[PDB]
Design a binder for this molecule. Structure first.
Ligand SMILES: [Mg+2]
Ligand SMILES: [Mg+2]
Ligand SMILES: [Mg+2]
Ligand SMILES: [Mg+2]
Ligand SMILES: [Mg+2]
Ligand SMILES: [Mg+2]
Ligand SMILES: [Mg+2]
Ligand SMILES: [Mg+2]
Ligand SMILES: [Mg+2]
Ligand SMILES: [Mg+2]
Ligand SMILES: [Mg+2]
Ligand SMILES: [Mg+2]
Ligand SMILES: [Mg+2]
Ligand SMILES: [Mg+2]
Ligand SMILES: [Mg+2]
Ligand SMILES: [Mg+2]
Ligand SMILES: [Mg+2]
Ligand SMILES: [Mg+2]
Ligand SMILES: [Mg+2]
Ligand SMILES: [Mg+2]
Ligand SMILES: [Mg+2]
Ligand SMILES: [Mg+2]
Ligand SMILES: [Mg+2]
Ligand SMILES: [Mg+2]
Ligand SMILES: [Mg+2]
Ligand SMILES: [Mg+2]
Ligand SMILES: [Mg+2]
Ligand SMILES: [Mg+2]
Ligand SMILES: [Mg+2]
Ligand SMILES: [Mg+2]
Ligand SMILES: [Mg+2]
Ligand SMILES: [Mg+2]
Ligand SMILES: [Mg+2]
Ligand SMILES: [Mg+2]
Ligand SMILES: [Mg+2]
Ligand SMILES: [Mg+2]
Ligand SMILES: [Mg+2]
Ligand SMILES: [Mg+2]
Ligand SMILES: [Mg+2]
Ligand SMILES: [Mg+2]
Ligand SMILES: [Mg+2]
Ligand SMILES: [Mg+2]
Ligand SMILES: [Mg+2]
Ligand SMILES: [Mg+2]
Ligand SMILES: [Mg+2]
Ligand SMILES: [Mg+2]
Ligand SMILES: [Mg+2]
Ligand SMILES: [Mg+2]
Ligand SMILES: [Mg+2]
Ligand SMILES: [Mg+2]
Ligand SMILES: [Mg+2]
Ligand SMILES: [Mg+2]
Ligand SMILES: [Mg+2]
Ligand SMILES: [Mg+2]
Ligand SMILES: [Mg+2]
Ligand SMILES: [Mg+2]
Ligand SMILES: [Mg+2]
Ligand SMILES: [Mg+2]
Ligand SMILES: [Mg+2]
Ligand SMILES: [Mg+2]
Ligand SMILES: [Mg+2]
Ligand SMILES: [Mg+2]
Ligand SMILES: [Mg+2]
Ligand SMILES: [Mg+2]
Ligand SMILES: [Mg+2]
Ligand SMILES: [Mg+2]
Ligand SMILES: [Mg+2]
Ligand SMILES: [Mg+2]
Ligand SMILES: [Mg+2]
Ligand SMILES: [Mg+2]
Ligand SMILES: [Mg+2]
Ligand SMILES: [Mg+2]
Ligand SMILES: [Mg+2]
Ligand SMILES: [Mg+2]
Ligand SMILES: [Mg+2]
Ligand SMILES: [Mg+2]
Ligand SMILES: [Mg+2]
Ligand SMILES: [Mg+2]
Ligand SMILES: [Mg+2]
Ligand SMILES: [Mg+2]
Ligand SMILES: [Mg+2]
Ligand SMILES: [Mg+2]
Ligand SMILES: [Mg+2]
Ligand SMILES: [Mg+2]
Ligand SMILES: [Mg+2]
Ligand SMILES: [Mg+2]
Ligand SMILES: [Mg+2]
Ligand SMILES: [Mg+2]
Ligand SMILES: [Mg+2]
Ligand SMILES: [Mg+2]
Ligand SMILES: [Mg+2]
Ligand SMILES: [Mg+2]
Ligand SMILES: [Mg+2]
Ligand SMILES: [Mg+2]
Ligand SMILES: [Mg+2]
Length: 248
RNA sequence: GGAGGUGGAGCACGAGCGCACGUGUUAGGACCCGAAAGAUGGUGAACUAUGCCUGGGCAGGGCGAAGCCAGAGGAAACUCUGGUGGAGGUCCGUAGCGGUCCUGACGUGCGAAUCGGUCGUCCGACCUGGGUAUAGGGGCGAAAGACUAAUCGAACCAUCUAGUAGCUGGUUCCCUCCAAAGUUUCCCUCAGGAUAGCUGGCGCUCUCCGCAGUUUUAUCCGGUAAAGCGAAUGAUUAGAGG
RNA sequence: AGCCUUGAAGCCUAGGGCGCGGGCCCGGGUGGAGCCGCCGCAGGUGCAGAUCUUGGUGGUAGUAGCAAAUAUUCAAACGAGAACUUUGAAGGCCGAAGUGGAGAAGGGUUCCAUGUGAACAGCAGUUGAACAUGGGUCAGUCGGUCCUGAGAGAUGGGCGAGCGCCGUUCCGAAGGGACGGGCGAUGGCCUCCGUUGCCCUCAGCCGAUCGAAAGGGAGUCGGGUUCAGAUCCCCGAAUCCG
RNA sequence: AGUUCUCUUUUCUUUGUGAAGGGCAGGGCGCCCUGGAAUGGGUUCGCCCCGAGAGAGGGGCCCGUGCCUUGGAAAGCGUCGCGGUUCCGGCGGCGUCCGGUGAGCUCUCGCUGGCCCUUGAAAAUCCGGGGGAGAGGGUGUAAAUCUCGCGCCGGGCCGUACCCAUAUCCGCAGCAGGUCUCCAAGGUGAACAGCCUCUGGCAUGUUGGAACAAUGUAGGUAAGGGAAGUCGGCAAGCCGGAUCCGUAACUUCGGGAUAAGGAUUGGCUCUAAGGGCUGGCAGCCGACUUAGAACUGGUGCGGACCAGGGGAAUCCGACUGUUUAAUUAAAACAAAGCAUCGCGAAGGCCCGCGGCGGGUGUUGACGCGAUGUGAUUUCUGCCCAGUGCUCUGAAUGUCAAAGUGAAGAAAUUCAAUGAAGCGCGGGUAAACGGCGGGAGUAACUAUGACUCUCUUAAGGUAGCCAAAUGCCUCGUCAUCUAAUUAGUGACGCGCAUGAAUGGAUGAACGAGAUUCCCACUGUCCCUACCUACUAUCCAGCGAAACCACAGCCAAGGGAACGGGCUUGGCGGAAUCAGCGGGGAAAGAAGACCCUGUUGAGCUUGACUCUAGUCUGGCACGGUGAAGAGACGUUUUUUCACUGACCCGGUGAGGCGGGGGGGCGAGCCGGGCUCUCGCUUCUGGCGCCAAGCGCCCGGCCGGCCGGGCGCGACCCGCUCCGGGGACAGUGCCAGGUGGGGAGUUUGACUGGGGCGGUACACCUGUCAAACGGUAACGCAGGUGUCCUAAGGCGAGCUCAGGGAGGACAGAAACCUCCCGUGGAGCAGAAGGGCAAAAGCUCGCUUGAUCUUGAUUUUCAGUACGAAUACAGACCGUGAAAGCGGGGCCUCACGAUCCUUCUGACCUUUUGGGUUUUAAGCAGGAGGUGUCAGAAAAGUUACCACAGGGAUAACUGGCUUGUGGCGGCCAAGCGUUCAUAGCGACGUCGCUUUUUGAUCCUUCGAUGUCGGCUCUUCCUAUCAUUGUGAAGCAGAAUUCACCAAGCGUUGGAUUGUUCACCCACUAAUAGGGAACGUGAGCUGGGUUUAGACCGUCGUGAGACAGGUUAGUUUUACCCUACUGAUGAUGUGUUGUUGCCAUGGUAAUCCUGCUCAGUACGAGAGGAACCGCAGGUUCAGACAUUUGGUGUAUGUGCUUGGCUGAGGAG
């Protein structure tokens, strides 16, 4: 046989991200003395569309505490922030929408977005449009907090991780039918070469496990074991179940 | 050490070595030409496939979305009527792009895919220039095993390599003499081999008793032709007497 | 003690013969420089075939054909020669999405003048993009040149048997610069200002380099001029940069 | 300048001003000032704007490519006129003027809006601003400084011609192909449409002349009919613009829609309405529209060009989009929608030989990755047994290495322990997939709601159906026709329908498949004519394919279809235009089929491996506490540590500890519990130190200039965090691993496959009286069985029958007699056997050890089996003897390897001892394809070498089957065998049926049917001439001579075949390579795409359905059709004969005979005559029709010649 489309995606080539017109990487501030002890003020200059991303991005500007400079930060835009607004990042920032605080100081039930997976990494979790994480509980003795991720999983993270109060803007995006193959063509022309997708049963056996046959049938169980070799791991990968999810 | 059997490519008063010539069998390119293949290392994205970058391009019409204005109706909700407006992977249709049917032309062509009419689409998932990226068990594929320089169910180039072929084709002067087999057995044996047979050549040991695809005379062997079933086995017709 | 310029090989021959034959001998002609008999030795040693190889030639055959896109005619000139060249006049066509006027890519002298009519231009040619002999491309301002784009690609580092590869800011002491000030050395319009070396002080850019004759990118227009070049030459009038 | 016969103050051409600077129009402003607005106003085509400041005034700025001006009239151009060397930027006159208009086109600037789950580059480079370190001079010849105006110097390098495409480029070429752009006139018109013209360009596309045959290619027309043609309306045709009216079912309410269906359209002369500027009015300007009316022509008017046929339905796919460049444009692919699955980053998925490697990822679950289905609507039932997937695990069978323990001299052996994975138990079908059978039963019959029963993991639910899915099948009913294998609607025990392998539906849409209808028509009846380009002849110029020799037939035989050969017919130069019968014509070593110990693509439950991956061990690999152990050491568990190792961030910017200061708490002003480190209202600013303390320098306490410290706490060993003795990596070990590699996937065979085993053996027969002898010949058997069923001895006699005997009988047990085997001897059969070879007892292990010879198969090899002996040990018998397996003929296995047994055995390499190992000899472990490889599929994407050794056509032999025909005569025919039939039997013929066979062809003979066209046969349907009837007539049946002439139009189907409708004298049957593809067509079959059902895990398959799928060459020879001609008659001509060959006419209707013959009646003829027609043939154009480029004459559209006229 030949290498299947899934295998070919990992080699880069025509399968790399379309990053020509993106505005940069959306991150929190790099943690420094100001955010470790107090807070720093910043002003929202612009809220911009980022190609390939549902959520808008905020362009916040801070004062450099050591030099005569202005620092431009590219934050994830929490819903409700506006241009000209003051945002504050640090340990002693106040619990307002758009402020960046360590999750340790946030009370139980706080809604956050752009939450650091590890302390200092500048924000990794709950960055998709409309999403957020909640704060469940703190363990001051071990300095660790329990949060609920948008997928529903619960995670124990360091209390020192920073995060933005509120939910990511641009929510409810998936509530609109696309209605058109052309509109889906434009959605992915800004992201990557993944569209349109050709079904496995519609290929020949040479380039897919499901291909071939005088009838368009899978011919083998579609739940494939977790340890299947690359080029064989297609279909429902390591599925715990199949069918309609009935109930909770 | 003896006696008697038995296994040995032995002894029993050498015959070998060297060289040359012929024939036969083989190993090698191996009598000559002939595969589909496989391997190593390289050259191609000037066609085409797909992603990206930067440019260019797409008459004239039809329908008439939202929004807006006015008039009328209504207790309210709101309703009706006339305009305005100009949406759309919207319709007719040009450029462009494409290529349905004629199963038309042509079919040693104008052309190793073209030509005519007729046709699809023509603001979009649109068309296109150049730059750039992906390279051969690899790419790329809105998926036809398609496309990857007229080459694709695995490109092209050189080498391995005079690849192997139980299979097809060919195999070059004269005369003289002799002259087959398509059968036995074994073989993943059935288009082929090995094997015995049939052939030829070289002789040698003798001769001027032996032998014979023949009969005769003796003597055995046999269970087919025929015949038998009022004899065994098997099959079978009819009466008759108890 | 072979033959041979008093004519070798080769080649041709309705010449004379020999041999069962493979073949050979002699005569005649052409040719022009070598060759053969016998005893042995040696072999890349004998062709009718292989859709054999290479070269040549037939019949087919003066045959298929020289039929896509409406179309030519009259007079004259040159000339050996005119359906096809040139001029004049008619009749037509392309009909501004052109059969018009200019470019990019590609070509590379095909451009221009004169000459030829051998070969080529599938008839002809007095003609041609053919052949021959000579010419022709002029810039601060039009492009390249510079920038970066998708991307390519060194060093540090890592990997690697190795040619090398990965990687492009990532495991790097990655700056050879600057207003100013201080110490000397020199000079010149030696007056006082330069230059230089060292020291002091200050210093993010964080990625070498490459990447577009359509992207970014200061600044040239009018008139004349050649056989062929001109926003380039000349005339006139301007402008940018240093 | 053109026209001027007439008219035209006419028609044509032409009628400038660059950059840069200045000035001004014009356009724009989300810019300012006054002011304060509802009776809200302003305002655009639309919008939109206002107390966050509208209207109204007055300003400011930006672009000004427009006009004036400097340039600049000197130049350029038009015209007229002079010179010269006359190849002069030659010289002069005049001119280069004044207005209008526009949804006009092209460009450009600007304003404002809509679209995006799309937001639409970077950098070089240039500029402004904030700040104020600094510098500049002391009142002047002023200084630093200047983005102001002039002036001075320089700008190197490379490209630059021309073509830019029916001839400069790529396709071998001056190739009808391909190849990126810019400018873009008048008329008609909606128009960058088509048609004509100006500017500019060209010479008809690599030749001309003359003809006007056939056949073509491309255009036209056609009376009457109108799809009857054909697989199919393919092709052509009808419709078409615009105005006005009008418009259904259905619908997702958007559509359908130009639905459908009508009317109108010219020319000319008018009327009305629709605006601008200036000073309810007056004046002057103007640009195209719309509507209405009269008049008018032979009803012709969208007059050319341009330009939708329509309707009713069914299937499929929602749509737009895409696709096999070069045979498939589709129902296939995609799609939005829907539903699953993995993953929280030390991660999922993937790449990579390699790493602190790489893509997703400039990412973070509203995401990325992997699948299925395929808009909407409605719904998506049951099954977890199978195969997958997944979850739990020391509770826990198997389980590698390593480690631990015991035995031993050690090698080694043994035990204990027990990772993953398998087993075990759950979940899961929008995972692959699946979703029964029999019988009885309701008061006629039929069904059978109901019941019984066997049964699976469910037993097919809602739906739907002879559907693209149903064999039977052309299902049945209805509708559509005259007639329908077609279509539609129903029915449904459905070979083999069915629910995201998605079921049912349904608007719009479709170069998708199908049916009907209206309209239209040359598709057809049934063909004709016309035009252009060929063909044709000529001048010039000029190939190629192909070729053993060649080129007339009949039959024969023959490699079974001859050009050659045999026997006959016969034969006459050289050629022209056509033609497609033949050359089993050319083209290409057949793609079908088979064989090959030849392949390749693909699959998997094939064999052997393998990357990756999961898992255990060892090493890197450390520190401390406890807990549990064992004997201060050491194994293990847990918790911690950091320093290896890893990850994240940062321009490695404030870390740890202490000091110092502020707010609270509290014990009796000080200590502590212990917290804090100065920024949260506003879309400002924020650095390059102020201040203080202490030192030093220069000049004359005063001026000038520096240094240090605090401000800005001190000390520290990892920059700061997060992990961490684990990740991870190196090397081993176990599992998984069609992701990937290599390879295999028997043979025989009346082709192969499927089926059988005729593959190793045995009996009888074949088999032809020695032996041997074949077939997928016939009838059978074998892969075992036996401690006795082997061995010996003795003693008996069996099957069957007859006759007797309590229960007792057909059959129990006892007795007598007969009994040649008719029984038994493991088994198949054949042979053999009677004091035995059978049966019963007694003793036993000759079924033991051993060397040779021989026989059978045979090669005179092996094995296997068997025969005689020989040497030992034995058994049995009194003994002679018999016995080393079975009464004989079958009952089985090499090398290599392993295992056992044997010897005071040999070797174990320098010697010795000992374990081990290897030798020698004899058994066993097995090769059944049985003289003995280790082995699954598919190919329709296919490949090579071959095969006519071998299948799919024709042809050949045969003729069972099919067809046709005789003979006998039981019967039938009321009677009567034979008018006409004819059983039981039997003899033939034919090769238009199917078989059987495999002779020819696999370096190719084009495979069904139709169409067209000719010919032949007779086994005769019709017609002519006849014979016989159970022949009265009429009608019919049987038979003869007989193939001259006929044998038709249609619906359904690809059809052959069939069925029906209709007409007819009749509607016979056949052959010619199942006549006929260089004759066509291509509907079917029979490539590659795709759908459904059944089958398969799958790739894939299906004499199962469905849809789309390239049809090449003649100019050669012959034959044929026509055309010149040739011999030889001295030449030549006119008129003729006819040898030979061809040959043709055919059937029916009406009237009369005649309502007659005949007949009871009903009905009902014939011959002769007359008048017509059908089919066919040969002509012809007077007539009617068709054509018509006489391009003949009118009409007429657009354009062009200034108009008229003429064109
Ligand atoms: Mg496919
Ligand atoms: Mg596969
Ligand atoms: Mg020999
Ligand atoms: Mg040899
Ligand atoms: Mg191989
Ligand atoms: Mg390219
Ligand atoms: Mg459209
Ligand atoms: Mg359209
Ligand atoms: Mg054709
Ligand atoms: Mg042709
Ligand atoms: Mg695209
Ligand atoms: Mg790769
Ligand atoms: Mg396929
Ligand atoms: Mg060879
Ligand atoms: Mg070879
Ligand atoms: Mg063979
Ligand atoms: Mg064998
Ligand atoms: Mg052979
Ligand atoms: Mg016998
Ligand atoms: Mg007999
Ligand atoms: Mg001769
Ligand atoms: Mg010489
Ligand atoms: Mg030699
Ligand atoms: Mg030769
Ligand atoms: Mg000719
Ligand atoms: Mg031509
Ligand atoms: Mg041009
Ligand atoms: Mg030109
Ligand atoms: Mg020529
Ligand atoms: Mg020239
Ligand atoms: Mg590199
Ligand atoms: Mg550069
Ligand atoms: Mg450039
Ligand atoms: Mg440029
Ligand atoms: Mg105002
Ligand atoms: Mg002048
Ligand atoms: Mg300032
Ligand atoms: Mg040029
Ligand atoms: Mg012409
Ligand atoms: Mg010409
Ligand atoms: Mg040409
Ligand atoms: Mg007609
Ligand atoms: Mg008519
Ligand atoms: Mg019909
Ligand atoms: Mg018909
Ligand atoms: Mg048609
Ligand atoms: Mg309709
Ligand atoms: Mg579709
Ligand atoms: Mg595509
Ligand atoms: Mg194709
Ligand atoms: Mg096509
Ligand atoms: Mg699924
Ligand atoms: Mg279901
Ligand atoms: Mg299960
Ligand atoms: Mg089923
Ligand atoms: Mg049902
Ligand atoms: Mg239906
Ligand atoms: Mg039906
Ligand atoms: Mg019909
Ligand atoms: Mg199904
Ligand atoms: Mg000629
Ligand atoms: Mg022949
Ligand atoms: Mg022929
Ligand atoms: Mg062949
Ligand atoms: Mg072949
Ligand atoms: Mg073989
Ligand atoms: Mg293979
Ligand atoms: Mg291969
Ligand atoms: Mg296996
Ligand atoms: Mg595998
Ligand atoms: Mg494989
Ligand atoms: Mg076979
Ligand atoms: Mg005999
Ligand atoms: Mg006895
Ligand atoms: Mg003995
Ligand atoms: Mg016995
Ligand atoms: Mg197939
Ligand atoms: Mg097949
Ligand atoms: Mg044969
Ligand atoms: Mg046959
Ligand atoms: Mg009778
Ligand atoms: Mg035979
Ligand atoms: Mg042949
Ligand atoms: Mg033929
Ligand atoms: Mg042929
Ligand atoms: Mg007859
Ligand atoms: Mg035939
Ligand atoms: Mg033929
Ligand atoms: Mg044909
Ligand atoms: Mg077909
Ligand atoms: Mg097919
Ligand atoms: Mg299945
Ligand atoms: Mg009477
Ligand atoms: Mg007439
Ligand atoms: Mg006129």
């Amino acid at each position: 046989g030949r290498v299947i489309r899934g295998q070919r995606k990992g080699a880069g080539s025509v399968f790399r991200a379309h990053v020509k017109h993106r505005k940069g990487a959306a991150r929190l501030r790099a943690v420094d003395f100001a955010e470790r002890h107090g807070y720093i003020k910043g002003i929202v200059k612009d809220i911009i569309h980022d190609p390939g991303r549902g959520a808008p991005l905020a362009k916040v500007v801070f004062r450099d505490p050591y030099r005569f400079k202005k620092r431009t930060e590219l934050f994830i835009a929490a819903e409700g922030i506006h241009t000209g607004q003051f945002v504050y990042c640090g340990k002693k920032a106040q619990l307002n929408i758009g402020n960046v605080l360590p999750v340790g100081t946030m009370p139980e039930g706080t809604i956050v977005c752009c939450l650091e997976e590890k302390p200092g990494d500048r924000g990794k979790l709950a960055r998709a449009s409309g999403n957020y994480a909640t704060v469940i509980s703190h363990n001051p003795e071990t300095k660790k907090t329990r949060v609920k991720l948008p997928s529903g999983s619960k995670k124990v993270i360091s209390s020192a991780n920073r995060a933005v109060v509120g939910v990511v803007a641009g929510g409810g995006r998936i509530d609109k039918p696309i209605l058109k193959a052309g509109r889906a063509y434009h959605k992915y022309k800004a992201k990557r070469n993944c569209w349109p997708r050709v079904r496995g049963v519609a290929m020949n056996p040479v380039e897919h496990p499901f291909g071939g046959g005088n009838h368009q049938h899978i011919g083998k169980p579609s739940t494939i074991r977790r340890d299947a070799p690359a080029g064989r791991k297609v279909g429902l990968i390591a599925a715990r179940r199949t069918g309609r999810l009935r109930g909770t």
